[PDB]
Amino acid sequence: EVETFAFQAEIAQLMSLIINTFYSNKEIFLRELISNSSDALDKIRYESLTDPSKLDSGKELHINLIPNKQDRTLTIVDTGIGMTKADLINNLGTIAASGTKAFMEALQAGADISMIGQFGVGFYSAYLVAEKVTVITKHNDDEQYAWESSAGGSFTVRTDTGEPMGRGTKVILHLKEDQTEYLEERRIKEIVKKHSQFIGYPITLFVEKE
């Protein structure tokens, strides 16, 4: 079963704004997705202080950045708390209706697209660079799921029975044809050093075969 859902009007609005607005500083998508991974890793860290068994699905708390030039994908993987099916359907755990409203109001009062993360909807900045985003997630409380959307108003959710992840979330960006600089090692290193240099978990940038 693949289930197909409509984005709530606010999110469809937000996604169309991200896709259509001329805005050159697209590189902030990676800061926003690393930020979301850090917040998910903080959540499982906190739960484990009182219940160490929550780490039976993997003790290591880390983020991996995986470029793949053959597939035109950049994947951000973390071993944070992951999301349940209900969280995926509910705007990937975000308060995206109210966040979208506050972000629009801020843009009127002089903010710019790079401030999106302040409003709790930074995930959607993926659409600055990707034509399609796939999110694979596993929470201790639930099965592994894949969410997917190429925007256009709808997203799908389906049980994933690809390679099991112990716990956490993988964001797979299928990059736009003109945004392949974000698969280049030196470009990813530069962005991590510029915007994510104090994140409190290891960030490993994977190498590709020649």
CB of 125 vs Cl ion, minimal distance in Å = 18
Site string for Cl ion, 83-112 (x = CB under 5 A): ------------x-xx--------------
CB of 93 vs Cl ion, minimal distance in Å = 11
Q: Select 10 or 160, whichever has its Cβ closest to Cl ion.
A: 10
- What type of residue sits at position 150? S
Breaks (C-N over 2.5 A) in the chain follow: none
Nearest residue to 82 via CA among 151, 155, 171, 156: 171
Q: How far apart are CA 158 and CA 91, in angstroms?
A: 15
Q: Return the axis-axis angle of helices 185-195 and 28-50, rounded to nearest 10°.
A: 60
Q: Select 88 or 130, whichever has its Cβ closest to Cl ion.
A: 88
Q: Select 101 or 187, whichever has its Cβ closest to Cl ion.
A: 101
CB of 119 vs Cl ion, minimal distance in Å = 11
Site string for Cl ion, 40-79 (x = CB under 5 A): ----------------------------------------
CB of 101 vs Cl ion, minimal distance in Å = 8
Q: Select 15 or 77, whichever has its Cβ closest to Cl ion.
A: 15
Q: Select 15 or 183, whichever has its Cβ closest to Cl ion.
A: 15
CB of 97 vs Cl ion, minimal distance in Å = 4
Q: Select 86 or 205, whichever has its Cβ closest to Cl ion.
A: 86
Cα first-last separation, the chain: 38
Beta-carbon neighbour count of residue 160 at 10 Å? Answer: 19
The answer for 184, left when phi > 0, alpha when psi is -120 to 50, beta otherwise, is beta
CA 5: distance to chain centroid?
19
> In the window 115-174, what residues touch Cl ion (CB under 5 A)?
none
Q: Which residue has the tokens 């071993």?
A: 79
Q: How far apart are CA 187 and CA 174, in angstroms?
A: 17
> In the window 173-192, what residues touch Cl ion (CB under 5 A)?
none
CA 105, 110, 116, 117 dihedral sign is negative
CB of 126 vs Cl ion, minimal distance in Å = 19
Applying CB under 5 A, the residues found at the interface with Cl ion are 95, 97-98
